[PDB]
From Swiss-Prot, chain A:
Protein name: Spike protein S1
Residues of the full protein shown: 510 to 545 of 1273
Record gene name: S
Subunit text: Binds to host ACE2. RBD also interacts with the N-linked glycan on 'Asn-90' of ACE2. Cleavage of S generates a polybasic C-terminal sequence on S1 that binds to host Neuropilin-1 (NRP1) and Neuropilin-2 (NRP2) receptors. Interacts with host integrin alpha-5/beta-1 (ITGA5:ITGB1) and with ACE2 in complex with integrin alpha-5/beta-1 (ITGA5:ITGB1). May interact via cytoplasmic c-terminus with M protein. May interact (via N-terminus) with host bilirubin and biliverdin, thereby preventing antibody binding to the SARS-CoV-2 spike NTD via an allosteric mechanism.
Organism (species): Severe acute respiratory syndrome coronavirus 2 (2019-nCoV)
Annotated function: Attaches the virion to the cell membrane by interacting with host receptor, initiating the infection. The major receptor is host ACE2. When S2/S2' has been cleaved, binding to the receptor triggers direct fusion at the cell membrane. When S2/S2' has not been cleaved, binding to the receptor results in internalization of the virus by endocytosis using host TFRC and GRM2 and leading to fusion of the virion membrane with the host endosomal membrane. Alternatively, may use NRP1/NRP2 and integrin as entry receptors.
UniProt region (Disordered), positions on chain: 10-32
UniProtKB/Swiss-Prot annotation, chain B:
Source organism per UniProt: Severe acute respiratory syndrome coronavirus 2 (2019-nCoV)
The protein's name: Spike protein S1
Subunit structure: Binds to host ACE2. RBD also interacts with the N-linked glycan on 'Asn-90' of ACE2. Cleavage of S generates a polybasic C-terminal sequence on S1 that binds to host Neuropilin-1 (NRP1) and Neuropilin-2 (NRP2) receptors. Interacts with host integrin alpha-5/beta-1 (ITGA5:ITGB1) and with ACE2 in complex with integrin alpha-5/beta-1 (ITGA5:ITGB1). May interact via cytoplasmic c-terminus with M protein. May interact (via N-terminus) with host bilirubin and biliverdin, thereby preventing antibody binding to the SARS-CoV-2 spike NTD via an allosteric mechanism.
Originating gene: S
Its biological purpose: Attaches the virion to the cell membrane by interacting with host receptor, initiating the infection. The major receptor is host ACE2. When S2/S2' has been cleaved, binding to the receptor triggers direct fusion at the cell membrane. When S2/S2' has not been cleaved, binding to the receptor results in internalization of the virus by endocytosis using host TFRC and GRM2 and leading to fusion of the virion membrane with the host endosomal membrane. Alternatively, may use NRP1/NRP2 and integrin as entry receptors.
Domain of life of the organism encoding this protein: Viruses
Coverage span on the entire protein: 28 to 50 of 1273
Amino acid sequence: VVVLSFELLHAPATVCGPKKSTNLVKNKCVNFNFNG
Amino acid sequence: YTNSFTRGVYYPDKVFRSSVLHS
């Protein structure tokens, strides 16, 4: 039995899932997903 | 012993704030 425990907002996120990042546009109302 | 006047104040969390009082 394997138990996985996660911590949020304690520090800058070091472990992430694989999601392809894109270039960030500026000055236009856009969805932002920074580090989750 | 000796008294520490106001020493020991540190930033409690990485989150940035400015020009605001925070409890």
